[PDB]
Amino acid sequence: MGVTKELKSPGNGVDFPKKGDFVTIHYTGRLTDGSKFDSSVDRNEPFQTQIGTGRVIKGWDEGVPQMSLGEKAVLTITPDYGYGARGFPPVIPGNSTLIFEVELLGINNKR
Numbered sequence: 001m002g003v004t005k006e007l008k009s010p011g012n013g014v015d016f017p018k019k020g021d022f023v024t025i026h027y028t029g030r031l032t033d034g035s036k037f038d039s040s041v042d043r044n045e046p047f048q049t050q051i052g053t054g055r056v057i058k059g060w061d062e063g064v065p066q067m068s069l070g071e072k073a074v075l076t077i078t079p080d081y082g083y084g085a086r087g088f089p090p091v092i093p094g095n096s097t098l099i100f101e102v103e104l105l106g107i108n109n110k111r
């Protein structure tokens with residue numbers, strides 16, 4: 001529904017994030033017009049977040065637990081599961097579909 005996932009490279013197929021876990025992710029975020037609005041890869045800084053607890057947009061909270069540890073995937077996120085009608089000024093317009101390349105590098109202490 002609000003997020004769908006295309007697998008690019010498989011993870012270990014065994015370890016999946018659960019609600020409340022902390023995950024480490026490398027990502028690149030783009031608009032559908034091609035604009036890159038952010039990239040942890042470009043700043044060489046893996047991004048850590050608790051998953052499933054609303055600290056990140058819903059598309060991440062729902063999509064990331066579907067990935068196995070080590071997986072590279074692309075999340076396509078509808079506005080309802082992203083920043084909605086307001087967007088995120090100044091970088092994400094209202095009603096933006098978001099495209100995230102995501103690599104699941106760690107779950108809690110597992111790498």
Ligand SMILES: C=CC[C@@H]1/C=C(\C)C[C@H](C)C[C@H](OC)[C@H]2O[C@@](O)(C(=O)C(=O)N3CCCC[C@H]3C(=O)O[C@H](/C(C)=C/[C@@H]3CC[C@@H](O)[C@H](OC)C3)[C@H](C)[C@@H](O)C/C1=N/NC(C)=O)[C@H](C)C[C@@H]2OC
Pocket residue numbers: 027029037038039047055056057060082083088091092
């Ligand atoms: C003072 C606070 C700053 C504080 C910033 C940091 C700790 C730095 C951290 C690395 C954020 C990134 O800095 C390079 C940027 O990430 C993006 O570039 C990105 O790629 C992007 O979309 N994301 C980053 C990677 C994961 C997916 C997604 C995300 O969910 O991000 C969290 C966020 C903005 C949550 C909103 C929470 C509000 C609520 O209304 C909304 O519901 C709809 C959701 C974000 C991790 C938040 O938890 C922490 C912060 N937030 N600023 C807030 C809350 O205003 C977005 C577009 C903008 C972010 O810089 C402003």
